[PDB]
Amino acid sequence: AHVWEDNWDDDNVEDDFSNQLRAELEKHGYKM
Amino acid sequence: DANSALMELDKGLRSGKLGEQCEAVVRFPRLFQKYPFPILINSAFLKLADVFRVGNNFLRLCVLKVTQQSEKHLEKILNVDEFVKRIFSVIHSNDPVARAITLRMLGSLASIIPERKNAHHSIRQSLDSHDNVEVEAAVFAAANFSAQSKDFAVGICNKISEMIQGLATPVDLKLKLIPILQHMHHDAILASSARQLLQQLVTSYPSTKMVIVSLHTFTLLAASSLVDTPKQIQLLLQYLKNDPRKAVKRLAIQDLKLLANKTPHTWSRENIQALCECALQTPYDSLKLGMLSVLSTLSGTIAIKHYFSIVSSPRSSDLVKLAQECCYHNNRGIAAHGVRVLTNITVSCQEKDLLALEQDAVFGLESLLVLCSQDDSPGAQATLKIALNCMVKLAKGRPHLSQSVVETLLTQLHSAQDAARILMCHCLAAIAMQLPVLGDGMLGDLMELYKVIGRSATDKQQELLVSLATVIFVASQKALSVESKAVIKQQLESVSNGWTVYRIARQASRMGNHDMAKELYQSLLTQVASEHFYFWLNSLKEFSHAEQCLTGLQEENYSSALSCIAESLKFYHKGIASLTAASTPLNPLSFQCEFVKLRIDLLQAFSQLICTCNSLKTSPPPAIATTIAMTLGNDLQRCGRISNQMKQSMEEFRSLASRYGDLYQASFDADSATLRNVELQQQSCLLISHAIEALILDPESASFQEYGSTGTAHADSEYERRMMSVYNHVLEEVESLNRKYTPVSYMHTACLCNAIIALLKVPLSFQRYFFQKLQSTSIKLALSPSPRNPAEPIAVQNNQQLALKVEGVVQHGSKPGLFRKIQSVCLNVSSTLQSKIDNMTNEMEQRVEPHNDYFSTQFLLNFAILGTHNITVESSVKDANGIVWKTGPRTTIFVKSLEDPYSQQIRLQQ
Amino acid sequence: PYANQPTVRITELTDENVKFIIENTDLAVANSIRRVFIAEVPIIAIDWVQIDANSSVLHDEFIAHRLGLIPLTSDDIVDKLQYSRDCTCEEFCPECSVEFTLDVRCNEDQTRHVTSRDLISNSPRVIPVTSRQDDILIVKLRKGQELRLRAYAKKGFGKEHAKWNPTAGVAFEYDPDNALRHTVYPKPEEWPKSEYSELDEDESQAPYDPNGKPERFYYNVESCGSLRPETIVLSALSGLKKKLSDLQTQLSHEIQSDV
Ligand SMILES: [Zn+2]
């Protein structure tokens, strides 16, 4: 089993919506 | 079209070239998985049997592989006797290759013909023919028929015993012949005869290559026919103790692992003791590792209670010494399994002398922490994750050692080389998620590691940044320091991805640090790229800002509280507008919008209630005393327009609680934490309802005391514990103040205001289903009446009946059983008179159980009414343990209703 | 060697009539499309008239003629019903037929105009077209005499009778400016323009095309009101599919018998 079950921070678990957000925001890659 | 594909593939079959014949033959399985129609399946299979009876042996191998691929459609075959007659009729050929291929196909047809005596006989004869390739094909065919039959199995066990004693055929063919005895789990006497045969086999052939397959078939036989598990275990322990072959001992390892994983409760105390003695007496680190893995699995299971069940000290028990010495052994994996055994036994059993074992286990635990922290190997990280599992399990099972283990993990956070830090950050996040004091105990050092991050890491900076920001929020569950968040912003603006800082922001929204959340959402809002993304980030920003305003609250000041409520409600209004802007036909934020709307309505109800609480003193008792006599009040005992508004608020709050129950039962897809959180919000609403009902309204009729268990720390969140403590406080205060005053509500308004202030002082917890959603399950639910392509109503003669033929197919976005597995579908259909008792007579529901992911059900409706009717259906998906879970489309169909002219004329004559 | 890619578009739709244009298809195919509208579209019409007692001055055969020429509503129950000639039942059964009744006694001094409204039907999905304006007149009855009859309506097509022909009128044409020169105009200026013509007012005659085919067929389908025109087209095409499928199966068996 994994170390922590309520893990929001994992790659393959996350769904289509903020996958698209991930694509955009990794393309952006900065904050002011 | 399906028929068209069928006979064009038939023409490809009738083509001259065997290449094109192979083309069509291997093209059938696509047609099977496209058209599941059974007549088509039967005709295609019949043409297959024809071409297999007359093909040129490569077509035969192609047809064989087609059957072996599309095996699952075999059960819907009608003309079984003709199919089997062709396929069996080609077995009399003199070509050994053709005989072998045919026997393999019979092994494939085992699913539909398990009783064919002639097939049994042909397999048994070709089993002792001489042609090699058909001998091994006969072995494979026996291996399938013995799985799906019984009398064939007893025939084959007699024949196999005869052959093995009869000493013909070489050792390789003996290896092929042994694994037939796995399918002897049909009866106990067959199992015993095969067991005697296998014991004789191992004693007759002391060879490694013999013994390995013999033992593995013997143990699968016992694990299937679980009657001789103790004999199996003691035989394996004998061979692990006695036989000096290292490979055979590794077989014993990988087999006792299987038995320990399958049937743990059958493990006995003498078995455990014998394995422990073997693990002490072994010289080899690898075999000791395997035995320790076996003991780790058994310790995780129930059998530790068997080993420490009395009717010999626990210290006198040989397990403890082995566990201690192997936990302090030099080798890393051995130490990992030792600390696994120690953690399991410590959490499981509670005897008086085990405190020394607790101390030894925790100290050897930071030994594993330092070793895996500065090892940096893949196996080292595996043992590290094992140690962190030991941490989570030990701390949750026993809260006694929590502060010690947290401070040790912080010392390792000092002493780590920036690879294991993410892992132990997750682990200590879990531990502080259980017990809150672990963060505000040592806020400083985690911030020090945070400031050394930037020049400490170069490869997984994003990952460790996200983890340590999560735990800094968990540590500063209280109001976050401006200097600390400025340092956080400094490092994030130094080096971060937008997706990274977004994940820090999401963790901030999860824990409740809404000021930091507001800042991060503001930055991400100012960048974004796309429109629904912008509106989504903007809505999140507004809820974070409103929650910041709500946390900006002062105790026992009602005017400032309602001002803060109004400000926060303005900001939720902006946020919910932007959320409706973010809403799209794809990925529709239904749960998010509905949940934030219910939170809005809860806060509006709170503001209205505290407004009426303040207006309690607006001469309502004077209005009552002016309208009627104060003594023996006609409207109520100490009557009040304020009491009327209390009744209105009570009914409104109960309706709000009903809406929360509706939201939860329509959601159904979230995990345990989110569903629990929604239950707590409904708990708060019902708490306010019961408080205003049992204190302002009739307390003698209330007569309710919370004479039940409450306040246990079995919760899954510190947030949940905080709301639960608030609930206990409100219950004790209302139970104290139930009978003290008259209904004039002197300090009753003060008690209600205190409850409101506490319930708003506990901030919020934005949650996972409000964020990333998983196990997206749906019901298509296509009805099939007379097809109404437009909204034109469907005419029925109204004298006979009407049939519906509803159909549903269930779909899953991922692994369907993440949290809840669908079990049954309660469909619910009712009628309504479209032209205005609302046609609520037919109130049908039916519990169809989807055996496969498609289902259909026939409904009959009776009606004799002139007007149009609307027909409504519901899915009512009910899960494994049994819950309502109202999801589904809830579609509606219009139906017309006309009558016979002869019937109308007869009614006119009537 | 293979079929082209024809195109379909529709200009306007009305309950009584529809207008559409077809392109990139053969004149033979288009003529067969008009003929399959005319002939084999199955509808429901009154066929079996039993007369208990007639005392009208119109004779019984005439009454049966007008009853057979009454139109009816045949939306989809015509597709549900089976042919009377093929359905194995004693006389007519409700799977292959529809029952009608007509009893009129003119007992009033004024002439009682027997109308299509007075036909009592057995199935609500089938009525005279007029009901669901002035009704269709059947016979004018003087005071004193009566007319009592029973009727059965069945399913047929226009190869049998124009009463089973449902299309009130087809207007099928092409080449509105005789560019294919199928006709020769001695006085093309005196020849009036078509409504689809795009030629000049001075010319009124497209130039001759040495290489071309007749194309861009214009269709105006006027129903009699029994069915929707789109349903009529779909039924005609479906019957064409069925007939070609039967011809294929029978001729394949003929080839199998030959070989
Ligand atoms: Zn019939």
PDB file of N, CA and C and ligand atoms in Angstrom, chain C residues 82-97, ligand 1:
ATOM      1  N   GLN C  82     -50.513  -6.677 -41.847  1.00  0.00           N
ATOM      2  CA  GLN C  82     -50.024  -7.552 -42.896  1.00  0.00           C
ATOM      3  C   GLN C  82     -51.082  -7.641 -43.986  1.00  0.00           C
ATOM      4  N   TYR C  83     -50.667  -8.090 -45.171  1.00  0.00           N
ATOM      5  CA  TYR C  83     -51.584  -8.248 -46.295  1.00  0.00           C
ATOM      6  C   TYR C  83     -52.716  -9.208 -45.966  1.00  0.00           C
ATOM      7  N   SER C  84     -53.925  -8.839 -46.390  1.00  0.00           N
ATOM      8  CA  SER C  84     -55.087  -9.694 -46.173  1.00  0.00           C
ATOM      9  C   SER C  84     -54.959 -11.001 -46.940  1.00  0.00           C
ATOM     10  N   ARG C  85     -54.385 -10.940 -48.141  1.00  0.00           N
ATOM     11  CA  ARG C  85     -54.308 -12.099 -49.019  1.00  0.00           C
ATOM     12  C   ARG C  85     -53.337 -13.134 -48.461  1.00  0.00           C
ATOM     13  N   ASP C  86     -52.349 -12.686 -47.675  1.00  0.00           N
ATOM     14  CA  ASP C  86     -51.272 -13.520 -47.153  1.00  0.00           C
ATOM     15  C   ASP C  86     -51.478 -13.930 -45.706  1.00  0.00           C
ATOM     16  N   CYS C  87     -52.265 -13.181 -44.948  1.00  0.00           N
ATOM     17  CA  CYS C  87     -52.468 -13.468 -43.538  1.00  0.00           C
ATOM     18  C   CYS C  87     -53.413 -14.648 -43.393  1.00  0.00           C
ATOM     19  N   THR C  88     -52.943 -15.700 -42.732  1.00  0.00           N
ATOM     20  CA  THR C  88     -53.706 -16.936 -42.609  1.00  0.00           C
ATOM     21  C   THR C  88     -54.697 -16.794 -41.462  1.00  0.00           C
ATOM     22  N   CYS C  89     -55.937 -16.477 -41.788  1.00  0.00           N
ATOM     23  CA  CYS C  89     -56.991 -16.314 -40.793  1.00  0.00           C
ATOM     24  C   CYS C  89     -58.319 -16.568 -41.493  1.00  0.00           C
ATOM     25  N   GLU C  90     -59.352 -16.867 -40.714  1.00  0.00           N
ATOM     26  CA  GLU C  90     -60.703 -16.945 -41.244  1.00  0.00           C
ATOM     27  C   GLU C  90     -61.160 -15.528 -41.551  1.00  0.00           C
ATOM     28  N   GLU C  91     -61.716 -15.330 -42.753  1.00  0.00           N
ATOM     29  CA  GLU C  91     -62.067 -14.026 -43.322  1.00  0.00           C
ATOM     30  C   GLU C  91     -61.018 -12.949 -43.031  1.00  0.00           C
ATOM     31  N   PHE C  92     -61.391 -11.815 -42.459  1.00  0.00           N
ATOM     32  CA  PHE C  92     -60.434 -10.788 -42.079  1.00  0.00           C
ATOM     33  C   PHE C  92     -60.219 -10.815 -40.572  1.00  0.00           C
ATOM     34  N   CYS C  93     -58.970 -10.692 -40.156  1.00  0.00           N
ATOM     35  CA  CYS C  93     -58.609 -10.639 -38.751  1.00  0.00           C
ATOM     36  C   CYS C  93     -58.042  -9.259 -38.465  1.00  0.00           C
ATOM     37  N   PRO C  94     -58.101  -8.805 -37.210  1.00  0.00           N
ATOM     38  CA  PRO C  94     -57.601  -7.455 -36.889  1.00  0.00           C
ATOM     39  C   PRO C  94     -56.111  -7.254 -37.108  1.00  0.00           C
ATOM     40  N   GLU C  95     -55.322  -8.318 -37.257  1.00  0.00           N
ATOM     41  CA  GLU C  95     -53.922  -8.119 -37.613  1.00  0.00           C
ATOM     42  C   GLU C  95     -53.789  -7.661 -39.059  1.00  0.00           C
ATOM     43  N   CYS C  96     -54.765  -7.991 -39.906  1.00  0.00           N
ATOM     44  CA  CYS C  96     -54.678  -7.695 -41.331  1.00  0.00           C
ATOM     45  C   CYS C  96     -55.826  -6.826 -41.834  1.00  0.00           C
ATOM     46  N   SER C  97     -56.595  -6.214 -40.939  1.00  0.00           N
ATOM     47  CA  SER C  97     -57.788  -5.505 -41.380  1.00  0.00           C
ATOM     48  C   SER C  97     -58.215  -4.486 -40.334  1.00  0.00           C
TER      49      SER C  97
HETATM   50 ZN    ZN D   1     -55.775 -11.840 -40.927  1.00  0.00          ZN
END
